[PDB]
């Protein structure tokens, strides 16, 4: 007797590709750092070095000859095992001085589209919190937000829409919190 959920009614050229990715994963600053170098044929990862395992491992049969040769050279292995510090942790020190220092305050604009669009644009980093208010009560049921949008120029944007029915004296507020802001930005809209 499984109980199910109901739905409710609505109101050519040939190409051969090779990739190598020297990736670093950071959690809690440099406390937890993981290095994963990936060798990829077309879209198939064939061999990788994961600093958590400490040796080359073939991901598919295509990568096995590479993994054996590289693992046979202990000089190569020792330099790969040190790369989590020599590359990842070393480069993170540069990021702390640059990319992780980058603070671009968002521009907050409200424009009608019974639908209010609060545009939160040109901000960095990604962490953001946007809320809608009708007077003193937060609006959530009639709110739809886009996902975080990556512009590709080291800025993000996000659009938060609110369906509303204006009354006399109604004040709608878009509330934005961002790490670059000393205090949250609030923008009001009146009919």
């Amino acid at each position: 007797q499984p109980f199910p959920q109901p739905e409710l009614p609505y109101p050519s050229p040939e190409d051969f590709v090779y990739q190598f990715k020297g990736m670093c994963y950071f959690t809690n600053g440099t406390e937890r750092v993981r290095l994963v170098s990936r060798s990829i044929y077309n879209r198939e990862e064939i061999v990788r070095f994961d600093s958590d395992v400490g040796e080359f491992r073939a991901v598919t049969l295509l990568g096995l000859p590479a993994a054996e040769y590289w693992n046979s050279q202990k000089d190569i292995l020792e330099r790969k095992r040190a790369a989590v510090d020599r590359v990842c942790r070393h480069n993170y020190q540069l990021e702390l001085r640059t990319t992780l220092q980058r603070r671009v305050e968002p521009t907050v604009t409200i424009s009608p589209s019974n639908l209010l669009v609060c545009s939160v644009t040109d901000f960095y980093p990604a962490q953001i919190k946007v809320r809608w208010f009708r007077n003193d009560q937060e609006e959530t049921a009639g709110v739809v937000s886009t996902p975080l949008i990556r512009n590709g120029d080291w800025t993000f944007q996000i659009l938060v829409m609110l369906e509303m029915t204006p009354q006399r004296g109604d004040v709608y507020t878009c509330h934005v919190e961002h790490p670059s802001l000393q205090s949250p930005i609030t923008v009001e809209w009146r009919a």
Partner: protein
């Protein structure tokens, strides 16, 4: 893999078609720089990063290793060629549209494989030349790519635009329309 930050030091790409190569570094999904392989020069995407030096010869030497490895895998894989995927195209503005205020149209071309694509812009149905730029091929965890093209514009009631995408995964060029409204 879950992490507070993810970086690629770097993304190395080489493909038989062309042949063509690419070297970039990425931090949290954004391109830090690319190396112009032809001119042998590092082109920083972020101004604050210009305080650093990166030897462009590393990219040339690395890509050369990729070229050697690619030739070996072509034979060993029994000439297993890349599969053309269907790219996903989205057009949106960088800032809210205000008529008469200079803005930027953004064309996101996602799920790109192989990394060979033509991204062009149309204005009122004719090709646009001035004001167009684009990122490099940006990596994805499934080993496809995405690429972003930019078109500067002056939003007006009488101009409408299209992002035109040519890819082998598309039998016809893909046109994504955008209007100021």
């Amino acid at each position: 893999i879950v992490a507070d930050h993810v970086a690629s030091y770097g993304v190395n790409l080489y493909q038989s078609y062309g042949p063509s190569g690419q070297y970039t570094h990425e931090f949290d999904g954004d391109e830090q720089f690319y190396v112009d392989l032809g001119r042998k020069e590092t082109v920083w995407c972020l101004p604050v990063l210009r305080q650093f030096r990166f030897d462009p010869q590393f990219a040339l030497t690395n890509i050369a290793v990729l070229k050697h490895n690619l030739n070996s895998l072509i034979k060993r894989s029994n000439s297993t060629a890349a599969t053309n995927e269907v790219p996903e195209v989205t057009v949106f503005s960088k800032s809210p549209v205000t008529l008469g205020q200079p803005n930027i149209l953004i064309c996101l071309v996602d799920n790109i494989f192989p990394p060979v694509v033509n991204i062009t812009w149309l204005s009122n149905g004719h090709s646009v030349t001035e004001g167009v730029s684009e990122t490099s091929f940006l990596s994805k965890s499934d080993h496809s790519f995405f690429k972003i093209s930019y078109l500067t514009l002056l939003p007006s009631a009488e101009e409408s635009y299209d992002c035109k995408v040519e890819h082998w995964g598309l039998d016809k060029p893909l046109l994504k329309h955008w209007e100021p409204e």
